[PDB]
């Protein structure tokens, strides 16, 4: 046969990769950082509780001014806030009871949302005739929408459960470029600051790196023993972190193309819900299904502190672009800001 002659060729290519990788595994991040001091006890206290959502909160996104922010909730409402004042900017009843993600145009002129509808509905907030109205519906994906990110006001990238992700020319309204390859539901993606590459994760126990301009897979990262629920880039863009049901979070670097660090604990038995870095990245924040959220010394993986204010899975989070504060959304209908 040729399948067994290629499966063993693949085995010898995995082995070849395991050779170069174990050859480049000269040292470990943990050994080098054993010397750096712990970050100490990171005990940020809730400073703003954002309520008005009536049920589980699924997604949120800060405005580029780091004052306004969008949130999505099971209440069939999408709320835009004024964080400095917490005053609500726009309350948007939704067409469906199940939205899984939301997003903000960097310019802010537009926002987008989606879910099982297989449509990413873009909403205009500054219509010439002073209104907040739907301005575009992006149809074409054949699975539930998991994450999406714009490239410009005319282009946007989305991820779906049909094993395909797609870039859309919004004026066209049709897929400009396709990003396939995962053999499982794609869950999240993170664009690079240069907005030229992006990484995606799926249930296929593999995460892949895509060149936004090209669209092909550049690198594949593995290690998890279950579907990768979340993924996050390192601020500098040469590395990124991943989260899975395997009860571990792991750090990968693009140039090293391997895992650097692992985050987990024995008294911790619940799963993680959402993750985020500090401005410098020394801190790694992670939600937890046991109603808690643990703060970790990202360079040392030690649990610096705990943010336990929710009674249920802390659904999502995100730090302000300036690092002033951190927002967390939860099934308790409560968004909590920390600092």
């Amino acid at each position: 046969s040729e399948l067994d002659q290629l499966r063993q060729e693949a085995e010898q290519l995995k082995n070849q990769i395991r050779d170069a990788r174990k050859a480049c595994a000269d040292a470990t991040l943990s050994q080098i950082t054993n010397n750096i001091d712990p970050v100490g006890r990171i005990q940020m206290r809730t400073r703003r509780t954002l309520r008005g959502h009536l049920a589980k909160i699924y997604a949120m996104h800060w405005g580029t001014d780091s004052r306004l922010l969008v949130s999505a909730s099971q209440d069939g409402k999408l709320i835009i806030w004024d964080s400095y004042t917490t005053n609500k900017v726009h309350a948007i009843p939704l067409r469906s009871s199940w939205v899984m993600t939301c997003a903000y145009a960097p310019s802010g002129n537009y926002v987008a949302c989606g879910g099982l509808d297989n449509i990413c509905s873009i909403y205009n907030l500054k219509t010439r005739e002073g209104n907040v109205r739907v301005s575009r519906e992006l149809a074409g994906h054949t699975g539930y929408l998991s994450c999406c990110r714009f490239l410009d006001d005319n282009q946007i990238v989305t991820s779906s459960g049909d094993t395909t992700c797609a870039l859309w020319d919004i004026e066209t309204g049709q897929q400009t470029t396709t990003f396939t390859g995962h053999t499982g539901d794609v869950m999240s993606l993170s664009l690079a600051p240069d907005t030229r590459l992006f990484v995606s994760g799926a249930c296929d126990a593999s995460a892949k790196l895509w060149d936004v301009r090209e669209g092909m897979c550049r690198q594949t990262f593995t290690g998890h023993e279950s579907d990768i629920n979340a993924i996050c880039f390192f601020p500098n863009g040469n590395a990124f972190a991943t989260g899975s049901d395997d009860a571990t979070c792991r750090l990968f670097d693009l140039r090293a193309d391997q895992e650097l660090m692992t985050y987990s604990h024995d008294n911790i038995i619940c799963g993680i819900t959402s993750v985020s870095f500090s401005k410098s990245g020394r801190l790694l924040l992670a939600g937890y299904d046991d109603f808690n959220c643990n703060v970790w010394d990202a360079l040392k993986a030690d649990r610096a502190g705990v943010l336990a204010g929710h009674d249920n899975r802390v659904s999502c989070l995100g730090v302000t672009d300036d690092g002033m504060a951190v927002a967390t959304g939860s099934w308790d209908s409560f968004l909590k800001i920390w600092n």
Binding site: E2, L3, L6, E9, A10, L13, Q16, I17, A20, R21, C24, A25, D26, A27, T28, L29, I32, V39, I42, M44, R47, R48, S83, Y84, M216, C217, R218, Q219, T220, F234, P235, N236, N238, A239, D253, R255, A256, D257, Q258, L260, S278, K279, S280, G281, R282, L283, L299, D322, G323, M324, A325, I337, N339
Partner: protein
């Protein structure tokens, strides 16, 4: 699935033909970026409550 395996093959052809970097060099670079951006980090270097929107608070009579 015949052409599919061929795709998997020439895809591993791509992946195996990459230039990797030693973990020491990469980690030193990352640590350097952290050090250069640790000073700007409010969560590690707290700012005056006056400047923080979420700490500004004072009033008596």
């Amino acid at each position: 699935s015949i052409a599919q395996a061929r795709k998997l093959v020439e895809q591993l052809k791509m992946e195996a033909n990459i230039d990797r970097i030693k973990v020491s060099k990469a980690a030193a670079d990352l640590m350097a970026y952290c050090e250069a951006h640790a000073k700007e980090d409010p969560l590690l270097t707290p700012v005056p409550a006056s400047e923080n929107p979420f700490r500004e608070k004072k009033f008596f009579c």
